[PDB]
Design a protein around this nucleic acid. Structure first.
Ligand SMILES: [Mg+2]
Ligand SMILES: [Mg+2]
Ligand SMILES: [Mg+2]
Ligand SMILES: [Mg+2]
Ligand SMILES: [Mg+2]
Ligand SMILES: [Mg+2]
Ligand SMILES: [Mg+2]
Ligand SMILES: [Mg+2]
Ligand SMILES: [Mg+2]
Ligand SMILES: [Mg+2]
Ligand SMILES: [Mg+2]
Ligand SMILES: [Mg+2]
Ligand SMILES: [Mg+2]
Ligand SMILES: [Mg+2]
Ligand SMILES: [Mg+2]
Ligand SMILES: [Mg+2]
Ligand SMILES: [Mg+2]
Ligand SMILES: [Mg+2]
Ligand SMILES: [Mg+2]
Ligand SMILES: [Mg+2]
Ligand SMILES: [Mg+2]
Ligand SMILES: [Mg+2]
Ligand SMILES: [Mg+2]
Lengths: 138, 177, 119, 118, 81, 160
RNA sequence: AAUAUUUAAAAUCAAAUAUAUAUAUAUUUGUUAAUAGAUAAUAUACGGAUCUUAAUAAUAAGAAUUAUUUAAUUCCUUGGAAUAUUAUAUUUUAAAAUAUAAAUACUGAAUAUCUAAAUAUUAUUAUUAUAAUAAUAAUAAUAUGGUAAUAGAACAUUUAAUGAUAAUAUAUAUUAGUUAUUAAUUAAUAUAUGUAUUAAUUAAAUAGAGAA
RNA sequence: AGGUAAAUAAUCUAAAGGGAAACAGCCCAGAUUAAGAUAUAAAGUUCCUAAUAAAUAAUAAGUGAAAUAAAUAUUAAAAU
RNA sequence: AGUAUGAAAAUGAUUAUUUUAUAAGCAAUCAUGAAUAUAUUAUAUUAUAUUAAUGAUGUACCUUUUGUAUAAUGGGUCAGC
C-alpha cells in the first residue's frame, strides 16, 4: 500500500521565467533641509525619467517628508532595503539607486570559503559508501 | 558491454588513503579529454536516476534497456536469503479444500487458546498467516489479548515507552524513500 | 649561550636540492645574459634573430665581470662544482676550516661557489 | 566522442569554470560568484563556455573546454549583492592605535537555468 | 507487481554485511527477481534493509521517467495489493 | 549538490580486521596505518570537526614485527607525579605484563591526534595476542568473497 | 699471505667542459667506517608516536638514519626520440597482441598573478552639469606595515547666528534590518513632550577617557 | 661570557605573515580591503600535521632521526 | 543636601532557553553538528537570533624599555569628573 506525504514546491526564480527582484523604489526628499539637496537635484534633472524608461518593471514613487533623504527599495521576497542618502551629491545618489536595483532582496550574510552553489537537487552521482567504493579499504 | 569507454576511479593527485577529504587534490587531477566510465561509489536506494532503474522496470520501447548501465555486479547464487518465508524457499501450496477451511474456522471460534494459529498450521501443513486469512477468532479472545497488551504497556517504565516510540518513528522512516 | 638559535650543523636533503636548484638558476641567468649579448651583436652586424640563434660562432662577452662569470675556474657551474662547495663554505675560525652554507647569512640570495684550493 | 549515455540520462551535472574557479552544478542550482560582474546586468543570460566536465551518474565527458556544440549551459544573473559588513581590528601589542580594517566584498548570484546535451 | 508483470518471484538476499553484534550495524540486501536485482536496501537491522530494498524497487517502478523520444508510456494502473 | 542524499552509509562505522601474522609491516608502520583508519582519513566524507573513523580489530598480535634490538632495549616510561617514581619498563617486560597488543595500542595512541576524540579512537582499536576474539562475527564481509572460504569453516565461525 | 706507511685527485690515472680538433693545450670533478672515550641531582625527552624487514604469501611492507642524486629508465641536442613500467579499453586464447593515457612530483606565506572593491598620483577616455572646471564612471600603470615625528580629511558632543516643519510629529531607550557603518537611517515596541536653537553653512569649545 | 669596545651589512627597534618544537634580532617575505583558481619563497611531504615516489652506496651503533664532544684506544676498509 | 522622572551601568536573587559531571590553560575568533525561539511572502529542502557537541588558531591591556605572557609598572567593577 502507498500513501502521499503532503509537500509543497520550491520556486527557483531564474530557471523558467525570471521575475526581476526589485519591484518598487521610493525617492524621499525634503524641500527644507540642506541634507536633501543632491536628492532634490536628482529628482529635478532628467535622470529619474531615463531610469524609469530603462526599468519599466520597477515603479518609482517620489515622496516628500521633513527628515533626511531616503531611498527605500522593495523586493520580490518581501524584504525592504532603506538607504539614507543624507548630504550625497546627485551622482552618489544615482550610484546608490543602481546598487539598490542590482540587489536581490535577501539579507546580507557571511559566507564561508567556497560556499558557492546552493542546490535543492539530490546528487547526480550518489553519496559515497564504503561498501560500494571502487577501491576497498585494505 | 555496449560502450568501450576507459574507466576511471575518482582520482586525487594526493594519497587517497590518507587524504580522501582533500578537495584540492581532486581539483588538481586533470585527465585527458574524452568520454569516461566512472562507476558510482554509492548504493542505489534513494535514486530515481535512469542509470539506477532496472531493465525490467524500463519500458519496452526505452532506448536505455540496451545500454549496459544497470550493472549486475552482485550474483543471486552467491547471496544468501534474508527474512524469507517458508513459502518462497519451497513453493506455495493450494491444497486445502472448502471443507477443511470450514473445519478450521469452526475450531478457531470454539477454542483459540487450544486451537491456536500455529497448531492449525502444524495440523493442515499450511501457514499461520493463511490460517489468519481464512478464519477470525472469537472477538472476546481478541479483546482479552488487547487488554493483556495494554497491561504490558502500562507495566513499562517511561524510558521503555520512549524507546518504543523512537523504534516506531524509525520504522516509519524506513518506508519513506 | 642561554638564547637558543636552534640551527642544525648540516642541511637536510630537501635543503640541498633547493640549494642545487638555486645554483643552477644563477648559471642559467648568466647563460641568458651572454646569449642575449651575442644575439644583439649578430643583429648589429646584420643578421635576423633566428639567424643569430642558429649561428655556429657564438660571441664571447667583452665586459669584464661577464667574462669572469663565464670562466669555470672563477665561477663554476652547479654540474662542475664539488659536492663540498655546494654545501660547505670556508670558515677559518671553524674546526675543519669549514661551515655549512646554510649558516651564512642570506645564503639563499648571496652566491659563494669557489673555496680555496686546499681548504 | 560518443556522448549518448549523457544525452539519455535524466540527471546530469556540469563543472564549468569562471576565471578558472570551478563550480559543480545541476539545473536549478544557484551559484554565488565572489565578485562584481560588470559585463552582465541583472536579468542577463550567461552562456557558459569553459566547461571542464559534463557528468551523468556513471559517465563523464571531459574537455578543456568541452566542445561548445555538444552541450548547453545557460546561467541567469539573479542579483548582484554583497557579503555582510565586517570590521576586524589591526593592532600591535603595546600600541593604543587600533586600525579598523573594514570589509564588505561583492557577490553575484547566478542561477543555472538550462543544462543539457545538445 | 512482479506477479502482474512477467517477472520471477522477488527474494531478498544479503549482499554485504558489517558490524553485526554492534550498536549500529550495516546490512546491504538486494531484492532479486531471478538474477536481476530490482531494489538495493541498506539498513541497521536485516529487516530494515529488506524493507528498504522493497521500497527502492517500488520507487524505481513508479518514479520511472521515460525520455521524450520514447513513444507514450501508459501505465497499467496502481499495484492493487 | 554533491552533499545532498542519504549519508547514513558514508558515516557507517565499519569493522576492519588485520591478521598481524599475515601482515608484513613493522610495528610502527602498522600503528601509523591503523591511526588513519581510526581517525577516518581514508573516507572522503571526513571532516576534522566530526569523529567518523572505523573500528580496527587486530589479531595474532603475538607475531608482530619489531626491528633492531627494540624488543629488549626500547623502554616505556611512566610517572605518577611524586618524585622518585619514574617507572621504566622494557618492551619485552611490557609484553610479559600485558601483551604485544598493549604495545601496538600505545603506538596507535601516540599516532592519534591529541584532543577529546583521541580516547574514543583508541577504544575503537581492538587488539588480540592470539587468534580467537569476540568480534570475529562483525568484520566487513561480502557475498562474492564466500566461494573462496570452505563450507564447514564458515559454520564453525558462526557457531563461535 | 707478511712487514710498514698513507687515508691522498697536489702529482698520478679516469671522467667531463672549452680553444685548433680522431690529437694537443687549458680548466673542472673523483680518495674510509664503526665502537669506546661519554658523565648529577622534580621525570623517559629525536617536539611526541615511532623508524633498521622477512622466504612461505599476499591487487600490498621492507628507514621515517647517513652520503651523492633524480622526478619512470636510456641515448641525442629546457626539448624531442626510444625503452620498458603502471592504469585502462579492445580483440584473441588467467595469458598474449593492438592502442589511449600518465610522465608537466607535491605541500606551502597576509609573496606574485588572476578575480573583484577602496583611496592617491600619472596618462588616456566616457557621461552629467580655473567646462583648460567639478562630480561620477571606465581603462593601463605605480603606490597604500609602521613607534617617535610631520602633513591632510572627517565624524560624535555643547553653545551662538540664520531656520521650514509637527502627536500621521519629535526625542530618548531596546530589538531586528539598511548604507564600505566611531555615524546615521528603516520598522516594531516603550516612555515623554503640543514639541527640535532641528537640516544645512558658519563661528567657537570645560569638544571624545581601560590607564595619573 | 647572553661580556666589553668600536668597523661593515642585515633584521629587530617601529614589521604582522610562513619556517626554525616553543622563539624581538636566525632562514624566507613586507598586511589598502576581500576573494581563493594559478604560480610559488624559506621550510617540509609514515601518523600527530597541509604534502612523495624513486635510484646507488654506507651504517646495525636506535649511531642517528633541526642544538655534531676532544685527545687517545680497539676493530675493520681501501691505496701504496 | 532643589523638585520631578529614571528598562544607565556595576551588583544580588529568581525563572526560561541552551550547553555542561573522562576534561586542562586571556575563555575569543573562525570552522561545524544539534536544540530552542521569532518570522501576516517559511512557497522550503526557508531566514535570522540565542546556546562553551566537536575541530582548528589564539602568550590580557597599558606604561617603560635594547627587549615584557612575563614572576617589571598600574588598574576590584561600573557611573560621573
Ligand atoms: Mg596527510
Ligand atoms: Mg593593542
Ligand atoms: Mg615596543
Ligand atoms: Mg686535479
Ligand atoms: Mg633526562
Ligand atoms: Mg622533529
Ligand atoms: Mg599582495
Ligand atoms: Mg601607513
Ligand atoms: Mg573634557
Ligand atoms: Mg567613565
Ligand atoms: Mg578606548
Ligand atoms: Mg651585550
Ligand atoms: Mg623605543
Ligand atoms: Mg616578525
Ligand atoms: Mg624596515
Ligand atoms: Mg606594503
Ligand atoms: Mg638516539
Ligand atoms: Mg639533538
Ligand atoms: Mg561526558
Ligand atoms: Mg581547569
Ligand atoms: Mg601569574
Ligand atoms: Mg603584571
Ligand atoms: Mg595592582
Amino acid at each position: 500500500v502507498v500513501k502521499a506525504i503532503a509537500r509543497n514546491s520550491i520556486g527557483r526564480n531564474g530557471v523558467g521565467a525570471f521575475v526581476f527582484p526589485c519591484r518598487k523604489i521610493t525617492l524621499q526628499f525634503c524641500n527644507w533641509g540642506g541634507s536633501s539637496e543632491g536628492m532634490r537635484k536628482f529628482l529635478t534633472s532628467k535622470r529619474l525619467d531615463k531610469w524609469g524608461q530603462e526599468f519599466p518593471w520597477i515603479q518609482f514613487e517620489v515622496m516628500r517628508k521633513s527628515g533626511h533623504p531616503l531611498l527605500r527599495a522593495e523586493y520580490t521576497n518581501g524584504r525592504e532595503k532603506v538607504i539614507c542618502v543624507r548630504n550625497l551629491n546627485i551622482d552618489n545618489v544615482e550610484n546608490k539607486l543602481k546598487l539598490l536595483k542590482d540587489s536581490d532582496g535577501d539579507i546580507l550574510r557571511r559566507r564561508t570559503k567556497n560556499d558557492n552553489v546552493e542546490s535543492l537537487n539530490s546528487s547526480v552521482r550518489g553519496i559515497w559508501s564504503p561498501l560500494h567504493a571502487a577501491k576497498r579499504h585494505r | 558491454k555496449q560502450f568501450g569507454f576507459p574507466k576511471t576511479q575518482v582520482t586525487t593527485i594526493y594519497n587517497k588513503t590518507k587524504s580522501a577529504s582533500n578537495y584540492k587534490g581532486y581539483l588538481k587531477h586533470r585527465d585527458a579529454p574524452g568520454m569516461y566510465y566512472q562507476p558510482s561509489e554509492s548504493i542505489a536506494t534513494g535514486s530515481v536516476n535512469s542509470e539506477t532503474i532496472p531493465r525490467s522496470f524500463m519500458a519496452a520501447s526505452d532506448p536505455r534497456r540496451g545500454l549496459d548501465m544497470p550493472v549486475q555486479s552482485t550474483k543471486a547464487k552467491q547471496c544468501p536469503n534474508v527474512l524469507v518465508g517458508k513459502s518462497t524457499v519451497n513453493g506455495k501450496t493450494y491444497h486445502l479444500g472448502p471443507q477443511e477451511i470450514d473445519e478450521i474456522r469452526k475450531l478457531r471460534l470454539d477454542n483459540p487458546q487450544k486451537y491456536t494459529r500455529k497448531f492449525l498450521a502444524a495440523k493442515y501443513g499450511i501457514s499461520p498467516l493463511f490460517v489468519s486469512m481464512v478464519s477470525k477468532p472469537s472477538e472476546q479472545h481478541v479483546q482479552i489479548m488487547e487488554s493483556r497488551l495494554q497491561e504490558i504497556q502500562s507495566r513499562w517504565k517511561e524510558k521503555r515507552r520512549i524507546a518504543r516510540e523512537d523504534r516506531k518513528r524509525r520504522k516509519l522512516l524506513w518506508y519513506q524513500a | 649561550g642561554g638564547l637558543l638559535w636552534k640551527i642544525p650543523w648540516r642541511m637536510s636533503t630537501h635543503q640541498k636540492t633547493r640549494q642545487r636548484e638555486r645554483l643552477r638558476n644563477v648559471d642559467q641567468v648568466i647563460k641568458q645574459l651572454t646569449l642575449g649579448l651575442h644575439v644583439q651583436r649578430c643583429q648589429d652586424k646584420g643578421l635576423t634573430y633566428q639567424e643569430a640563434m642558429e649561428s655556429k660562432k657564438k660571441y664571447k662577452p667583452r665586459s669584464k665581470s661577464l667574462r669572469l662569470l663565464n670562466k669555470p675556474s672563477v665561477f663554476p657551474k652547479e654540474n662542475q662544482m664539488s659536492s663540498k662547495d655546494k654545501y660547505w663554505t670556508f670558515d677559518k675560525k671553524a674546526v675543519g676550516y669549514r661551515k655549512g652554507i646554510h649558516k651564512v647569512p642570506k645564503w639563499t640570495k648571496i652566491s659563494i661557489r669557489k673555496a680555496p684550493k686546499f681548504f | 566522442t560518443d556522448t549518448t549515455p549523457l544525452k539519455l540520462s535524466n540527471e546530469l551535472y556540469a563543472i564549468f569554470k569562471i576565471h578558472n574557479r570551478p563550480y559543480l552544478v545541476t539545473e536549478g542550482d544557484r551559484v554565488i560568484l565572489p565578485f562584481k560582474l560588470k559585463q552582465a546586468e541583472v536579468g542577463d543570460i550567461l552562456n557558459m563556455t569553459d566547461v571542464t566536465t559534463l557528468g551523468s551518474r556513471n559517465y563523464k565527458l571531459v574537455g578543456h573546454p568541452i566542445n561548445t556544440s555538444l552541450y548547453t549551459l545557460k546561467a541567469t544573473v539573479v542579483g548582484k549583492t554583497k557579503r555582510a559588513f565586517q570590521t576586524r581590528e589591526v593592532t600591535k601589542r603595546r600600541n593604543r592605535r587600533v586600525r579598523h580594517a573594514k570589509s564588505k566584498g561583492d557577490l553575484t548570484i547566478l542561477r543555472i537555468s538550462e543544462l543539457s546535451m545538445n | 507487481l512482479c506477479r502482474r508483470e512477467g517477472l520471477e518471484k522477488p527474494v531478498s538476499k544479503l549482499v554485504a554485511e558489517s558490524g553485526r553484534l554492534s550498536k549500529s550495524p550495516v546490512f546491504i540486501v538486494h531484492v532479486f527477481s531471478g538474477e536481476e536485482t530490482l531494489g538495493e536496501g541498506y539498513g541497521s537491522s536485516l529487516k530494515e534493509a529488506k524493507a528498504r530494498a522493497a521500497t527502492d524497487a517500488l520507487m524505481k517502478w513508479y518514479c520511472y521517467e521515460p525520455l521524450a523520444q520514447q513513444e507514450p508510456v501508459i501505465d497499467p494502473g496502481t499495484v492493487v495489493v | 549538490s554533491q552533499k545532498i542524499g542519504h549519508s547514513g552509509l558514508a558515516f557507517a562505522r565499519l569493522w576492519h580486521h588485520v591478521d598481524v601474522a599475515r601482515d608484513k609491516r613493522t610495528l610502527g608502520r602498522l600503528a601509523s596505518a591503523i591511526a588513519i583508519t581510526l581517525i577516518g582519513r581514508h573516507k572522503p566524507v571526513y571532516h576534522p570537526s566530526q569523529d567518523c573513523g572505523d573500528y580496527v580489530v587486530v589479531t595474532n598480535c603475538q607475531k608482530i614485527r619489531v626491528t633492531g634490538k627494540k624488543f629488549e632495549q626500547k623502554t616505556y616510561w611512566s610517572h605518577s607525579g611524586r618524585p622518585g617514581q619514574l617507572k621504566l619498563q622494557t618492551m619485552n617486560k611490557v609484553v610479559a605484563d600485558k601483551g604485544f597488543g598493549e604495545i601496538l595500542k600505545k603506538a596507535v595512541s601516540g599516532m592519534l591526534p591529541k584532543n577529546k576524540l583521541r580516547k574514543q579512537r583508541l577504544d575503537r582499536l581492538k587488539v588480540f595476542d592470539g587468534s580467537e576474539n569476540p568480534y570475529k562475527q562483525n568484520i566487513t564481509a561480502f557475498a562474492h568473497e564466500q566461494s573462496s572460504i570452505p563450507e564447514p569453516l564458515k559454520e564453525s565461525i558462526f557457531n563461535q
